[PDB]
A paper describes a structure:
Human enteropeptidase (hEP), also known as enterokinase, is an essential enzyme in food digestion and is localized at the brush border of the duodenal and jejunal mucosa. Activated hEP can stimulate the conversion of trypsinogen to trypsin via cleavage of a specific trypsinogen activation peptide, namely Asp-Asp-Asp-Asp-Lys (DDDDK), which is highly conserved in vertebrates. However, the mechanism of hEP activation remains to be established. hEP contains a multi-domain heavy chain and a catalytic light chain, linked by a disulfide bond. The functions of these domains and motifs may be involved in protein anchoring, macromolecular substrate recognition and inhibitor specificity. The light chain is homologous to trypsin-like serine proteinases with a typical Asp-His-Ser (D-H-S) catalytic triad responsible for peptidase activity.
Author numbering:
A (entry chain B): 785 to 914, 926 to 965, 972 to 1019
B (entry chain A): 336 to 784
C (entry chain C): 16 to 186, 198 to 247
Write the structure that this text describes.
Amino acid sequence: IVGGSNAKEGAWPWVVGLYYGGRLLCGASLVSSDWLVSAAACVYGRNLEPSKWTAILGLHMKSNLTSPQTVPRLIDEIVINPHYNRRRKDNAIAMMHLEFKVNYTDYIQPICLPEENQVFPPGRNCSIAGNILQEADVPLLSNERCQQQMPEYNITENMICAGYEEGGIDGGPLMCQENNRWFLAGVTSFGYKCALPNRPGVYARVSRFTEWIQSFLH
Amino acid sequence: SSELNNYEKINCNFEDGFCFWVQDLNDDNEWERIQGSTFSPFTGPNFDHTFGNASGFYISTPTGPGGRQERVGLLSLPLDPTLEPACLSFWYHMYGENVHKLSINISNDQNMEKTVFQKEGNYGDNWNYGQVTLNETVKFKVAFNAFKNKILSDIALDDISLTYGICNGSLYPEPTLVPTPPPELPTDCGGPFELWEPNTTFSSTNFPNSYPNLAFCVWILNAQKGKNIQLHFQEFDLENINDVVEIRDGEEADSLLLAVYTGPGPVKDVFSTTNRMTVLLITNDVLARGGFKANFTTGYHLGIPEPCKADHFQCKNGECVPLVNLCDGHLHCEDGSDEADCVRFFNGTTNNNGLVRFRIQSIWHTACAENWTTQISNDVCQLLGLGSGNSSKPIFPTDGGPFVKLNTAPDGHLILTPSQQCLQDSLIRLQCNHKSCGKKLAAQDITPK
Amino acid sequence: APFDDDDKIVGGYNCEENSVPYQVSLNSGYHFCGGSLINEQWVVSAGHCYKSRIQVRLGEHNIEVLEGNEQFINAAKIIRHPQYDRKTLNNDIMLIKLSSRAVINARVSTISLPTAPPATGTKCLISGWGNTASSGADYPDELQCLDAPVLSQAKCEASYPGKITSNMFCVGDSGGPVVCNGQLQGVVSWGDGCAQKNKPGVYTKVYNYVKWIKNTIAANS
């Protein structure tokens, strides 16, 4: 985030980074000890060589990789959502499997999946995350105003928008606290023009794919 | 000044160096001279018009690939008052893809300019003869402006021959200036369409050579009802993510994806489920590769191995395990389907609630809680993918199904026995909380600033 | 609908590849060619990219945004190949000596010299700030990488009749490093158009100039 403040080391243990051949390519949300969840629009076309991918778990600072809190892991399987598209760009989610199991350390904790029949109301301030992992508060907006602001593309119900109305501060997960517990309300998918007004930002609604994600956690 | 002839002032061969001229002193670009050839190849000609053999000096654009645009203008000065017009003989070498326009303006001491001459495009490959007269009598501050455009915009010129009077009949005009920036206007976006009876051998768009860029084709492989599609490949050599093949299996508006292959090397085959395999081509505009082949062979249940009947449980990878790994604690099927979750809830409001519905090997049923403890409580919590046992209490016996007697032992695995001998059975209303979810587990402080 | 994925956050550069330590940008007021960092005091580039004053920018990722990990070292001396045929672009390879030794770290390191010729089909890594569109002029300020297998010599000579020499083989981009299996095997030299039909990229084989580079470094260290 451009207009974001530095987050405390350890406040977001479920925030990791994906490295494609030793280069940070996209973000992912650690859901289980062996299966992650990331956007399909960034890992598309690279699922043929899973050995090249690698996920650094518990990563907070790139220059502080020598700390023992960072646990490296190797990818061996990438599963893209079947309903993914490149022309329509619908349901851009993809899971990635880990090679060996990892322990839930102090800086490595799993994220909570949004249960069914649970809709996040608009106007709900909750920050996101994903060198220094900064964070900034992002409120929730309605789909009608989001479609009216960007009439060039049809935003269906399968995605939810969240961002500032006036812009300026806009693979990262959409973490929104609920009953002293953070959920996965979306993933940072795309943006027309950063640091531009009337640009909330549409995120993939994870609550519509709970049974799809939980089917591979076992 | 006055005694100096105007021809030698204007006409110049610039073989060893520039004559008495005023080329550039104020603008942000200065013309350069090329001795036949220089760096940045395809810079117009390889020689001048006079010498013409690998050693000719001719003026051209200052550099080759420019980062941005530069205004280059050849200046001049007024001459003696001439009654007759001024014959201007010259031969330009305009060529390139991003060529810009050049004008010849006339200025005076009253802040008045005129613009009537302008050309742009590729004029052959040799020097194109040109002629233009001048209707200027006394005061004329003429200039020859141009622009240093992007790559493939180099323009050359040589042997200025401005004279007086009227020259002979100019019978050497430009034959045909073809617009190169719009070379072919590729907007086909077509080619092969939804296929038919097995004419498997077919080119994608231009297969027997490297394929061009910006091409967006589509191949909708169809078949009869109940027949699947197979996509065996004999040769596959494409580019990276920029050039992929989004194999689709939509059959309707809701399109589904099966596999996306790219790069060189023979990739694995595709085995569709429906009778309509849509194959779309997505190519970038950088480093187009050769291509690939596709020979579809329809049939029934291709790829998917035939499941064995007569009491043979087939896990999701095709392996058969009749009764050896029917949720007993083994990992024969590597996909985990043999040891899949044979436990669930029943009449549950939320996810982590419900009955104690249990399946020993085949049939689902309830259980009993005569020897229920916290050990087996957290055991069935973890087996159901939950946290620790918060509470557990029965309500009433609902059905008389084959309930199982749960037991405990230090060997780790629980002892089960589906005995139908139990009065007033206590059905377990399992109330297990969730596991360690995304909550603040570290020792964070409270610094609201 | 993620049609333009460019609203990323801290990290995750805006649609560009990174982690290429041997990639350097030659600057003379504007980006014109790339480079290849083989050691701490020498940079390999294309022969046609020779200029009077070139500022070798090491560790550059965004040519317009300063990230704090860049190393600006001026060129001390540039020595082109003596048999560089300017007409046919033969021996399109030159060496650029740095004025000071670069600080080797996790973002700036050295590339290994090639010890074997690249075989047909060898995967290679090519980087540069070249054009991404075949029509027009679209040169972004982002560093893009592209992989490509080495093509056969027969098809390479057939695609360019009389233009492919023994030191050439098919596989802002001028001078881009072509590293195959951790070894710099090729250098971007030229190409007919921008991704034209039956017109693959032409690359100069550094395996034939390993000895020349070693002799030039030893005689100018």
